[PDB]
Structures are given as structure tokens and as C-alpha cells.
């Protein structure tokens, strides 16, 4: 199943104050207008890609979504990120698990007994090596995953949502939670939920993207500027306005097709 | 679903003592609602013991009770009724049961594991 | 508590219905009964039958339901064959949580 991203997984690029200023940039973001993969909780959590990175969502109110896992093979043969987001905080680890059939969890039985996850239930892990740890429908909470030079990185945003179907068109920005200097390889990921929900995902790319940064430091307005020619015009003029009038972007040139290699025959 | 399994069948004397465990299978011992009943053999049965979800309190039917008991064991997933000083009425198959089973995800049903038959005499 | 008594047998012919019928102090205590019933048949184990003399349990072939209110509770037998053939317990089960106790029996039989 897909639907439209519309302006979603802007994100601030780096720690430093700006504002009232159209500042432009080149790193991962989801493009404009692509595609996002949308899944359900009705019998769906296999291995996507991770791909340069991955935006993430879901519009929840059970809270039923409650983690992540990444890693290249995610079967103890590396260290695998593990993220949860249990009761209030996030949570973090990067153990050499050995998940179960699904990332099913485990949950919360009657308490007169005591109430746990159980560690999935069947495995879950087989080697230590945890080389890291640390501890912090209504609602849509964003997300952004990416690994760069061995920085992996979440950003979020929470927001109160009316439209139950899709990701709302519209927009808001996303604050870093964590960066994570881990070192690990991503190429692939998965999402937890209980066992008794939706979620959403797309691929970043690299991307010049032009931020206008508010009065009050804050993203509240962006151009990807590759999504089409008026876009690289906004970000060639550095503005959000565009006067009528012919404004050359860029060089339109035939991409090579093919390799062709010759030598003396000898 | 879960199952459970009795401890096959059993001899013990008069005045002495027995423990019947009951494996639980599938999944895990203290998410259930473990209960004991005994059967007079072929006749009624009568209630001894269980676990209510309420305090998790492992009560007693008070014609068996204190000389009757029970306990756990999770790193087997094993309920136990352990009746001492045994009787003439005490040659009884001996049930275990549970109002709930689950599957990680909850549910509230009562099978029983058909029960140990035991033999008591001199 | 909610102690409890049944009649012997019940019994009919091959492919007769009938009706098992449990007496005794009060319901349930805490509401309507929770009296659940366990069908053992002649020389073999129990299974769950009816529950809170209402609620059906897996694997049960339509040809049994509950009956009765108060200090009684009652199970339907039908198309009485083989199997059917079976001692029917009442139990009581107040609020999962309030002392059970164990009725009886009502040995159903194809009636020689």
C-alpha cells in the first residue's frame, strides 16, 4: 500500500541557531511528493531496506508501536540497534540480539502475578557485545533514522492528527532526539509492536534543500529544490518568491550510457 | 493455546504425603489462573485449591484446607498441589485447571488436564 | 459460598435430547452464575463444557447449551449418542475470584 509524503522529515541539520534567513543545504531528506510504503497490524513487520536512511511514522492512540531494530543481517553475526519506547521514555540498545520470528515483544499480562514483556518470547538473543545503552487515532509521531560516518541519529516530532488515512498535508519540523557515534552498519530495519496499528516509511536521498528559519529559530518552511524546476529556481534565486520573468538553474547534459574502453590489442 | 499436563498417575500410603505437579505448555505458569479439584474415583468431583486473580491468592477448600497446599515453578512452568497425611476418600484422580489461558495476547477460559489417578492403601 | 448438587444420570435412547440440571444455596456469588459445566466421558477425561451458563467453548458441535438462573443452573444434552455419553459437572465460578465447588455429576448414558 502507498501514499503521498507531502512536505514531511524536514529536519534541523545542524545544532546552531538561525533566523528570519533562507538558509540552503545539502544532506538526506525524504523528497517531496514521494511515495511512502504503509503497513497494518492485521497479520507485517518483515526486513524493509534502510537505504541511505529512513523516515518513519505512525498515527497511533493504542500505543501498540513501542521500537525499532537495524543493522546489515539483524542475526547476532552483527551488533544490532535496538530502540524502544516504553511507558514514558526511549530507550536504547545495540546488543548482538538473535530476534525472534517477528518483532512481536512480549506484553503486559494481569498484574496479579506481575505485568512484563517477556524478550519476545521464542529467543530474542544469543551474545552480548551491547557496545551501548542509554535510557530518556490522535496523535502522528514522526520520525527520522540516518547513519552517517558511524553518527546514527533520530530526530521526531509529536503532533495531534484529525486525518485518520493518510500523512497530512501541511507542515512541522523535526528537533534531534539522539546522535549516536555507535559505528554500526544499517542496510536493513524492522519495527516493534506488541502482540494482541499502522505505520508509515520512505527513503531519504540526498538533497539541496533551502530552510527558511523563522523569527523563533524554527524550520517552518522548505523547498527540495531537485523535486522540479521551479524548485531549483526557488533555491538558484535562494527564495521562496519567484518574480515572472526566465531564470537558468542549471546545464541539461546527456548522461553517459556506457563505458566504452580500448587499448592496442596486445 | 495452551496445555496442561498431569503428573502421570501415583501411588502413596495412608499418612503419607503426595505432590502432583501439572506442567503448563505453549506458554508460561503464572499468567493462569491455577486451580485443583479432586474426583472420588468415577463419582463427584470436589474443589481443593487455586489461585484467584484477585490478591493471586492461592485458597483452600476448607474441608482440605492447611493439609492441603500448593506451589510454583516457573523454570519448568509447573503448578503443584501437595496434599500430606493421606486418607480413604484421597484415592482420587487429582485435576488441575485454569480459568485463563493466553497466547501472549490474553484470553480467560478453563481446560483442565485430565489428572492424575492415585492409588492409596496399606 | 455457592455450593452446589445435581440429579444421577439424565440418560435417553440413541438420539434422544435431555436436560442436566444442578441445585443449591445461591448463584454465583457477585452476579448472574458463572456455574460452568465439564463433560467426562466413561472412562476418559473432562472436557469444558458451557460456562457461566452461557458462553460455548471451542470444539462444541451446537448440540448443547445453558439453562436456569439463581440458586440452579442447567446444561441441554441433544441427538444423544456415544461421546454424548458422559458425566456433565456443575461448578461453581464467582467472579473467577469467590471459592469454587464441584457438583455430583449427571452420568448421561444411550439408554440399554
Known amino acids: 500500500a502507498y501514499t503521498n509524503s507531502f512536505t514531511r522529515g524536514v529536519y534541523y541539520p545542524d545544532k546552531v541557531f538561525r533566523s528570519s534567513v533562507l538558509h540552503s543545504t545539502q544532506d538526506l531528506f525524504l523528497p517531496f511528493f514521494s511515495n511512502v510504503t504503509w503497513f497494518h497490524a492485521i497479520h507485517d513487520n518483515p526486513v524493509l531496506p534502510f537505504n541511505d536512511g529512513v523516515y518513519f511514522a505512525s498515527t497511533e492512540k493504542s500505543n501498540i508501536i513501542r521500537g525499532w531494530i537495524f543493522g546489515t543481517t539483524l542475526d547476532s553475526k552483527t551488533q544490532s540497534l535496538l530502540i524502544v519506547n516504553n511507558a514514558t521514555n526511549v530507550v536504547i540498545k545495540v546488543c548482538e540480539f538473535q530476534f525472534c520470528n517477528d518483532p512481536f515483544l512480549g506484553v503486559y499480562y494481569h498484574k496479579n502475578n506481575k505485568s512484563w514483556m517477556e524478550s519476545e518470547f521464542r529467543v530474542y538473543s544469543s551474545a552480548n557485545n551491547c557496545t551501548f545503552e542509554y535510557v530518556s487515532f490522535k496523535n502522528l509521531r514522526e520520525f527520522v533514522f540516518k547513519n552517517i560516518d558511524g553518527y546514527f541519529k533520530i530526530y521526531s516530532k509529536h503532533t495531534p492528527i484529525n486525518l485518520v488515512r493518510d500523512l497530512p498535508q501541511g507542515f512541522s519540523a523535526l528537533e534531534p532526539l539522539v546522535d549516536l557515534p555507535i559505528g554500526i552498519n544499517i542496510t536493513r530495519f524492522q519495527t516493534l509492536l506488541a502482540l494482541h496499528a499502522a505505520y508509515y516509511v520512505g527513503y531519504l536521498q540526498p538533497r539541496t534543500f533551502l530552510l527558511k528559519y523563522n523569527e523563533n529559530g524554527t524550520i517552518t518552511d522548505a523547498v527540495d529544490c531537485a523535486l522540479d524546476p521551479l524548485s531549483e529556481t526557488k533555491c538558484t534565486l535562494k527564495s521562496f518568491t519567484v518574480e515572472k520573468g526566465i531564470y537558468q538553474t542549471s546545464n541539461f547534459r546527456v548522461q553517459p550510457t556506457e563505458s566504452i574502453v580500448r587499448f592496442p590489442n596486445i | 493455546q495452551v496445555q496442561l499436563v498431569q503428573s502421570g498417575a501415583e501411588v502413596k500410603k495412608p499418612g503419607a504425603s503426595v505432590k502432583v505437579s501439572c506442567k503448563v505448555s505453549?506458554?508460561?505458569?503464572?499468567?493462569?489462573?491455577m486451580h485443583w479439584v479432586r474426583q472420588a474415583p468415577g463419582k463427584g468431583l470436589e474443589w481443593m485449591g487455586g489461585f484467584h486473580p484477585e490478591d493471586g491468592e492461592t485458597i483452600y477448600a476448607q474441608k482440605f484446607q492447611g493439609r492441603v497446599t500448593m506451589t510454583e515453578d516457573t523454570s519448568t512452568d509447573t503448578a503443584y498441589m501437595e496434599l500430606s497425611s493421606l486418607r480413604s476418600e484421597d484415592t482420587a484422580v487429582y485435576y488441575c485447571?485454569?480459568?485463563?489461558?493466553?497466547?501472549?495476547?490474553?484470553?480467560?477460559?478453563?481446560?483442565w488436564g485430565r489428572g492424575t489417578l492415585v492409588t492409596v492403601s496399606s | 459460598q455457592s455450593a452446589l448438587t445435581q440429579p444421577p444420570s439424565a440418560s435417553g435412547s440413541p438420539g434422544q435430547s435431555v436436560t442436566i440440571s444442578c441445585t443449591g444455596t445461591?448463584?454465583?456469588?457477585?452476579?448472574?452464575?458463572?456455574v460452568s459445566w465439564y463433560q467426562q466421558h466413561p472412562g476418559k477425561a473432562p472436557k469444558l463444557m458451557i460456562y457461566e451458563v452461557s458462553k460455548r467453548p471451542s470444539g462444541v458441535p451446537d448440540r448443547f447449551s445453558g439453562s436456569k438462573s439463581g440458586n440452579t443452573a442447567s446444561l441441554t444434552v441433544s441427538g444423544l449418542q456415544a461421546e454424548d455419553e458422559a458425566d456433565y459437572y456443575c461448578s461453581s465460578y464467582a467472579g473467577s475470584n469467590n471459592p469454587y465447588v464441584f457438583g455430583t455429576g449427571t452420568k448421561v448414558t444411550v439408554l440399554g
Open positions: 505453549g506458554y508460561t505458569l503464572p499468567e493462569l489462573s
Open positions: 485447571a485454569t480459568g485463563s489461558p493466553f497466547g501472549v495476547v490474553t484470553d480467560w477460559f478453563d481446560p
Open positions: 445461591s448463584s454465583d456469588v457477585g452476579g448472574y452464575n458463572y
